[PDB]
Amino acid sequence: GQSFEQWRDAFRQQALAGGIDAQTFDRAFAGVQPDPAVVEADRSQPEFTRPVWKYLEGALDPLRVRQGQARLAQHARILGEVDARYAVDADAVVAIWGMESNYGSHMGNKNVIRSLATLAYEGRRPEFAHAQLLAALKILQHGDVPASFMIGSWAGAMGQTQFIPTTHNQYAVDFDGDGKRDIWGSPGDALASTANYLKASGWIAGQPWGFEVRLPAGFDYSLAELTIRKPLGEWQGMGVQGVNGGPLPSGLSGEQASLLLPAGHRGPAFLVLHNFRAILKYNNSSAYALAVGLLADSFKGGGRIVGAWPLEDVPLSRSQRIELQRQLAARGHDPGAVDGIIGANTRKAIRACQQEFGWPADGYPTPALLDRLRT
Numbered sequence: 508g509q510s511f512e513q514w515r516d517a518f519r520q521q522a523l524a525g526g527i528d529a530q531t532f533d534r535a536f537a538g539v540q541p542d543p544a545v546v547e548a549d550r551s552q553p554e555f556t557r558p559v560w561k562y563l564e565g566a567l568d569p570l571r572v573r574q575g576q577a578r579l580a581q582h583a584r585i586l587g588e589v590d591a592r593y594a595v596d597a598d599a600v601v602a603i604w605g606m607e608s609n610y611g612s613h614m615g616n617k618n619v620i621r622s623l624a625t626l627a628y629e630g631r632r633p634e635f636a637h638a639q640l641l642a643a644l645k646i647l648q649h650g651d652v653p654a655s656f657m658i659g660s661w662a663g664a665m666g667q668t669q670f671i672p673t674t675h676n677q678y679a680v681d682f683d684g685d686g687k688r689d690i691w692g693s694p695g696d697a698l699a700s701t702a703n704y705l706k707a708s709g710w711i712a713g714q715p716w717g718f719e720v721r722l723p724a725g726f727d728y729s730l731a732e733l734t735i736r737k738p739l740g741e742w743q744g745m746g747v748q749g750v751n752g753g754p755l756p757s758g759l760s761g762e763q764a765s766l767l768l769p770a771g772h773r774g775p776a777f778l779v780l781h782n783f784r785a786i787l788k789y790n791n792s793s794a795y796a797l798a799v800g801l802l803a804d805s806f807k808g809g810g811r812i813v814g815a816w817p818l819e820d821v822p823l824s825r826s827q828r829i830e831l832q833r834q835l836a837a838r839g840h841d842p843g844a845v846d847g848i849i850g851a852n853t854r855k856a857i858r859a860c861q862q863e864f865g866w867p868a869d870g871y872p873t874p875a876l877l878d879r880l881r882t
């Protein structure tokens with residue numbers, strides 16, 4: 508509709524047609540108007556880094572590590588039961604909990620119905636918003652939480668787990684048996700829900716998400732690519748070693764792994780395994796998944812990175828990523844659609860350009876590359 512009131516009246520019809528009761532709808536929308544803060548967040552396609560090392564610094568903050576250790580102790584019984592029942596490592600569940608809501612202290616302060624209605628009414632992704640809004644109304648109808656306490660982020664990610672509504676409906680768990688899947692106020696429900704989602708996403712209990720490695724001299728950096736997987740044994744037969752030298756972890760010889768270079772060839776290198784892919788299902792960002800894995804490791808005194816981070820790591824802004832794609836295309840290295848998103852097609856073009864300049868082909872774009880392109 509044109510007015511918010513008009514849009515809501517029309518959506519109310521769709522909500523009823525989808526099985527939401529009038530009382531649930533009217534209770535959910537009581538007092539609701541568009542939220543400009545949500546509109547701003549939706550619109551803000553940013554202009555600034557990063558870099559991964561500052562992001563990891565915040566994520567691996569000793570304050571967050573110690574708070575997770577405290578939570579592991581406080582909730583040891585529940586976590587033991589969740590770890591055993593879902594076959595998902597407690598440290599990973601708690602690391603996700605820390606990264607998503609700071610173990611429940613930062614769930615956001617926005618009402619999920621207001622936020623999703625705002626996005627449905629005037630957001631850039633109304634298909635997503637409408638779908639999530641109807642799912643959210645189903646959650647209210649089922650009674651998992653009262654409308655007043657259905658809290659989450661601007662994009663509709665909810666509660667301690669930051670599940671979007673359709674993910675809650677599919678994977679949230681009632682751990683304590685009161686009949687509510689309360690990912691807002693019940694640590695047990697939240698933790699079991701997170702575990703259930705990780706397990707559905709392929710988690711193998713006890714298997715590392717990945718680990719730091721040392722690459723051999725004259726390494727083929729075009730292989731550092733998440734879309735390329737190889738057995739650990741094959742990586743070993745390529746000259747990839749443990750971070751201090753010597754063979755890679757034993758027994759895993761047949762495990763498929765990809766090479767992750769979060770700061771290009773001058774930075775630390777990681778082999779990442781299937782459990783890393785599981786974390787990406789939670790949040791499809793390699794920086795996020797690396798932070799979750801290192802945080803999980805940190806609870807037990809791990810998470811130490813041996814390779815130095817490059818001092819000159821200054822990630823490209825939105826503007827620069829678009830400029831990079833245009834300059835690559837102009838030089839004859841086709842990155843595909845100029846969308847300002849560095850994915851596989853752009854990395855392919857970056858690698859060809861790096862090879863043209865005689866640089867290691869790590870597919871990792873830097874201000875130096877952009878300068879050289881402008882010559």
Ligand SMILES: CC(=O)N[C@@H]1[C@@H](O)[C@H](O)[C@@H](CO)O[C@H]1O
Pocket residue numbers: 664668669670671674675788789790
């Ligand atoms: C924790 C969580 O809900 N993560 C979701 C994932 O469930 C959903 O499939 C994805 C689609 O791209 O959007 C993310 O927000």
Ligand SMILES: [Ca+2]
Pocket residue numbers: 680681682683684685686687688689693696
């Ligand atoms: Ca419950």
